UniProtKB/Swiss-Prot annotation, chain A:
Tissues of expression: Ubiquitous. Expressed in platelets.
UniProt lineage: Eukaryota, Metazoa, Chordata, Craniata, Vertebrata
Description of what induces expression: (Microbial infection) Protein levels increase upon infection by human coronavirus SARS-CoV-2.
UniProt crosslink position (Isoglutamyl lysine isopeptide (Lys-Gln) (interchain with Q-?)): K10, K25, K26
Biological source species: Homo sapiens
The name this protein goes by in its record: High mobility group protein B1
Curated annotation (Swiss-Prot), chain B:
Lineage start: Eukaryota, Metazoa, Chordata, Craniata, Vertebrata
Tissue-specificity statement: Maturing lymphoid cells and central nervous system.
Impact reported for Y324A: Deficient in both nicking and hairpin formation
Full-length numbering of the shown residues: 396 to 1007 of 1040
UniProt name for this protein: V(D)J recombination-activating protein 1
Location, primary (coarse class): nucleus
Gene for this chain: Rag1
Cofactor, how bound (note): Binds 1 divalent metal cation per subunit. Mg(2+) or Mn(2+).
Amino acid sequence: FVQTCREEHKKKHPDASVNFSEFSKKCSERRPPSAFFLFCSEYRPKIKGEHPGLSIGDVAKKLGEMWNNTDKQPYEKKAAKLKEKYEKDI
Amino acid sequence: LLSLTRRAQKHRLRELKIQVKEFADKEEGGDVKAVCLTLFLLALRARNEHRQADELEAIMQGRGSGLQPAVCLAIRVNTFLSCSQYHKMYRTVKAITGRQIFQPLHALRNAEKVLLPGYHPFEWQPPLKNVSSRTDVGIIDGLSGLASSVDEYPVDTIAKRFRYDSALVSALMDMEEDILEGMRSQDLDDYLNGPFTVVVKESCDGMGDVSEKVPEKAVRFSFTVMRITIEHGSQNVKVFEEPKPNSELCCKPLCLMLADESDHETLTAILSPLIAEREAMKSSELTLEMGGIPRTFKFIFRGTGYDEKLVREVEGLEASGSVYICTLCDTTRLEASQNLVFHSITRSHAENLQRYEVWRSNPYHESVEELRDRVKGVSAKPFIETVPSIDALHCDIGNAAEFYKIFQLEIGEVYKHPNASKEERKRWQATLDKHLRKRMNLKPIMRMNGNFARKLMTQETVDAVCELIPSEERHEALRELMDLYLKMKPVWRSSCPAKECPESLCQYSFNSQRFAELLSTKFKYRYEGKITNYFHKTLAHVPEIIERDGSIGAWNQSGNKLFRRFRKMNARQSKCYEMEDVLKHHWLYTSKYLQKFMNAHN
DNA sequence: GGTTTTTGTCTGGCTTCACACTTGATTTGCATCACTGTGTAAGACAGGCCA
DNA sequence: CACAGTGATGCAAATCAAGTGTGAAGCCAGACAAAAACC
Ligand SMILES: [Mn+2]
Ligand SMILES: [Zn+2]
């Protein structure tokens, strides 16, 4: 019953959110990073500062599109170095 | 508290321990375990930590990071690991990961007991004739108390078996999950218990040389649950049917013996108790508890798994070279060759038992040839009721053999050369071989097989062979013959022709008659009083077999390999217990229950 | 009938994952390869009884 | 003959890894009454 009693009362009380106790009373009563990956970690601040509320999908989509359009050789160098370091790591 | 060690935590919680033990003993009868389990699960759920609470529930149900001993058993059995090997892997993985991912050997034995015959209780109403009512019986001696003294007949064989009813019980309990879910899938209620009918393909083959190195031969008597229907009102709705009837996987072993399938005395001695048990079950209901509810089963046994040699042996008939070429009818080789198609299924087990008695009693005092014609081949007493069928393979093979002979004879034009010599026909055969190699890339072989038949029975092959035939009038005939063959082939090649090819199933008799007519008119040269059992069955009995059995295809050469595998790797090297271990192992290996685990990645 | 239980009802504000999107270099999944030994049964072949 | 079953192979498809803001899903509390079995 209680669910029907409240539903009815949704217009009885115009907009009030009723209490649990009282309502009961009333019802009762009724790896190393990719080159691109290290790049994105470094470039997240530039993209973020220029657009602060960009979602993850949006920021990543941008980062990806502009870096895909690109120059990026030092990223691949750093990636290869970190790769062989991790390889050594046993 | 958690950075503390065991004695520390015991001390610093001793007070709450005493209070909790008091509350538990005073409210739940001392079931501290259930109280702590529910307390911790409820606390976890209270903290919104549903992941760890669910994983704890799964560890108590045994589903995550600890394999259920049944899954260990499925793996071990299904990978042929010995106990020594299995234990090595178990101890090693546990030592290196600290966690007991696989269960110990004693747990696997205990999980075995459930899956082996003799575990669940059951009843037969009325009690089975001459069968013990004990339900805790498992593996029993296959000799069934055969005398072994030096005076008696010499026993050269070791065998082990199940009691046929107990095995049926274990196989049903094994498939319980499929039965309930199939009941659901037909929009029926889980708790229904009305009489289920189980159809059971019964099967028997010799397994050749089993020896590990003298030949050591083995016979395997086995069964397959083919279909389980439930009765709702007055409709019989199927709740289960096996998808792969012929698989090694669902062929439940009943007895394994170390004997020759042609060693008649031993065979009857070992198999006769099993048949006695099956006879008993033919007139009784089985009461068996599934899912808390008692369910009732009744069985239909159909010995369709017997190749021709074993059929003839168990039904009292003569050896394969006989003139009585068919185990379904009384035709002779000459009759069946002259009379192409009009033949009907005649024989039955009872008719054979009476024909034996007639042979035996010679009531009309006839000579041996007259008596042999009277009983149409039944010179020995039958002792198994079979349902002799045909293999789709043999239909294709018999047809292809006939077409091959027709091709070579049409190249040689044998009607014009009635007194042609052996070497002229040989050159005809060579001509056809050469041209089939050039046009169809067919390596001539000297032993007929399924792949050759499959590639040769094509219309294009007929065009290729016509390229060597002068008369085009005979091109007409050969092409029509091959067209009729291609119309009849689906009927016997499908697994359910009443849906996959109903046009052809209907037209089958019309086509068979036309095919025989065209043979009897245009192709008279290939009549010489000889025909094969396979060809006779294909042209005379196929529609009758589909009427009886529903399919050709649905009703063991890995049997040998699998037997030898188990024996070598999973069995005690002692005559006393090797067969026990092999039978037990094969039985486990056919359980749908363990198979489900092995398929878990789907 | 009284005396005992199960299982709901009404909120929100909480906590804990899954998804969202990209890039490309790893990692898995899966079917396939080439290949002979072995079982099986299709089909040569040895054989002895009686005319 | 077919075919079983070996270790290798090769290509397609997950997968990983980072950022974090969502949305979904389940749970809490307290007075209390339905739908239910126990004397
Ligand atoms: Mn056989
Ligand atoms: Zn016949």
